[PDB]
DNA sequence: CTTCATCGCTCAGTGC
DNA sequence: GCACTGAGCGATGAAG
């Protein structure tokens, strides 16, 4: 039939759906890494310059 | 006859929900990364004499 | 005249 | 009895 057109197209759909899914996971990991670094940074700065409205000059992101 | 239409609707909903999630997390990633940059910045201006890349290494991105 | 990336419809399972 | 989703199949819209 069009066996080869179909194998190619099936490979392509599996590629692109995997692409979006891993990109979503990737963001979730970047968010994770970031929020953790963020708390470390924020607490260290609150420690060091305790006369600064840190959580106001850089409000937390959700 | 009907399972067909209702299934079409749910498949629309699935593609959308997941695009919404990809967007939401796409955004949270940028928000936290900019916040990370400004915190390193402000710590480097308030505690300049101090090494933040060995207390709190950057995670690439 | 390829070659590829998305995505919409459908079907078959998969968890309410 | 049902909503959700992984996946195949054709469009469709580029890219060369």
Residue numbers in the entry:
A (entry chain A): 174 to 235
B (entry chain B): 176 to 236
Task: Give verbatim excerpts from the published study on this entry.
We crystallized ZEBRA’s DNA-binding domain in complex with a 19 base-pair (bp) DNA duplex containing the CpG-methylated ZRE2 site in the EBV promoter Rp (TGAGmCGA; hereafter meZRE2) and solved the structure at 2.5 Å resolution by molecular replacement. Unlike the single helix of a canonical bZIP domain, whose N- and C-terminal residues bind DNA and mediate coiled-coil dimer formation, respectively, ZEBRA’s C-terminal region folds back on and stabilizes an unusually short coiled coil. Our crystal structure closely resembles previous ZEBRA structures bound to the AP-1 site and to the Rp meZRE2 site in an alternate crystal form, apart from the dimerization domain which exhibits variable bending. Each ZEBRA monomer recognizes one of the two meZRE2 half-sites, which we denote ‘A’ (half-site shared with AP-1) and ‘M’ (methylated half-site). Consequently, only a single (hereafter ‘CpG-proximal’) monomer senses the methylation state of meZRE2. The CpG-proximal monomer recognizes DNA bases in the M half-site through direct H-bonding interactions of Asn182 with G2, Ser186 with mC–2′ and mC1, and Arg190 with G0 and G–1′, while electrostatic interactions with the DNA backbone resemble those in the A half-site. Strikingly, the Ser186 side chain is positioned precisely on the local dyad axis that relates the two CpG methylation marks, allowing it to hydrogen bond with both mC bases. By contrast, in the methylated complex the mC1 methyl group sterically selects for the g+ rotamer, thereby stabilizing the H-bonds with the mC bases. In the AP-1 complex, the Arg190 guanidino group forms bidentate H-bonds and is coplanar with the G0 base, whereas in the meZRE2 complex it twists out of this plane to form a bifurcated H-bond with the G–1′ base on the opposite strand. The resulting configuration is strikingly similar to the mC-Arg-G triad observed in methyl-CpG binding proteins (MBPs), whereby a conserved arginine hydrogen bonds with the G base of the CpG motif and contacts the methyl group of the adjacent mC base (analogous to G–1′ and mC–2′ in our structure).
